[PDB]
Structure formats: structure tokens, C-alpha cells
Design a protein around this ligand. Structure first.
Ligand SMILES: [Zn+2]
Length: 170
């Protein structure tokens, strides 16, 4: 069911500037948006992507939306900065990671199946296409920075995914 929607598909503004990194991403880092909240229709999820891009570009002065990709409750994938582009989601990992945001607050609630499947499919495409290292490490934001992101319940879910990696003795 999951489609990869382009920047133009969701009416993205141009990035002010694009910095690349080379070679397949050794890290995949999972986030939740927190705000905006879950979006269930493509129209709402495209607006959610423009809201995050506008917050990051216009209020924070960033080059672009900080995430590599967004996932909606429509079960669609939204291109953010995309593969091999330096992110603004996970300081120290921005130049060697795919930053994937599941739109919504997943502290307590588990994302619906179509969002989890969409995230797993995006990762599989990336490995398939050589954008994600075949030995990639899957992390939650909270493993590399003091944060609740990507929410306790979503963190418990990705802990069950293949390539989920412990990077510290905790
Ligand atoms: Zn995060």
C-alpha cells in the first residue's frame, strides 16, 4: 500500500541549501513528531509535512525540514531531505544517518500497522538500493541524546525490529 511521495507531491518549499554525505548510511534513527499529532489522511499528512518544514525553515532558520523522511497515518512515506543528505534531527549522526519521523505522539500509543510497515519498507528499499548500510544500526533518538523521542511505546516497538542496536552499557 505504501508509496514514496516526492517533495513536490506534498508541496515542499525548496531547501535553502543541500549538503551531501557519501556511501550507504550506517545509522537509521527513529523519531516521533510529537507535534503535529497523528494524521490519518494524505491531505492532513502533506499539511503535517509542510507544518514541520515551515517550523524548521522559517522559525528555526534550518536549510530544510530536519528529517530524511516522514511517515503518515495514511501509511505513505514523505521525502524530507532524503537519502545521503545531511539532516538536522540527531546531532553527531546527521551526516551518517537516515532520520525517519513517525508523525504523532507515540509516548503511550503504538502507531497503527500501516505506519510501522511503511517505516520498515522504507528501510528495506534503502538497503535494497544501497542508501542504507547492509549492517546498519537502528536507533531511537533517545539513545544518542537526552529526549523521550521517539516516545516510550514506539521505542518499545522498534526495540523488536531487526538491526535494533545498543550503543551504551545501559
Ligand atoms: Zn527525535
Amino acid at each position: 500500500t505504501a508509496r514514496l511521495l516526492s517533495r513536490s507531491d506534498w508541496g515542499a518549499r525548496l531547501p535553502k541549501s543541500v549538503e551531501h554525505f557519501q556511501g550507504p548510511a550506517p545509522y537509521v534513527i527513529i523519531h516521533h513528531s510529537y507535534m503535529p499529532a497523528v494524521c490519518y489522511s494524505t491531505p492532513d499528512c502533506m499539511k503535517s509535512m509542510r507544518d514541520m518544514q515551515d517550523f524548521h525553515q522559517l522559525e528555526r532558520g534550518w536549510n530544510d525540514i530536519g528529517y530524511s523522511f516522514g511517515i503518515g497515518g495514511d501509511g505513505m512515506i514523505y521525502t524530507g531531505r532524503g537519502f545521503n543528505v545531511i539532516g538536522a534531527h540527531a546531532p553527531k549522526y546527521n551526516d551518517k544517518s537516515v532520520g525517519i519521523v513517525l508523525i504523532g505522539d507515540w509516548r503511550t500509543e503504538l502507531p497503527p500497522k500501516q505506519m510501522l510497515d511503511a517505516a520498515k519498507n522504507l528501510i528495506a528499499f534503502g538497503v535494497f538500493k544501497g542508501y542504507i548500510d547492509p549492517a546498519y544500526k537502528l536507533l531511537g533518538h533517545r539513545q544518542v541524546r537526552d529526549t523521550e523521542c521517539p516516545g516510550g511505546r514506539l521505542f518499545a516497538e522498534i526495540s523488536s525490529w531487526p538491526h535494533f542496536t545498543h550503543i551504551n552499557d545501559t
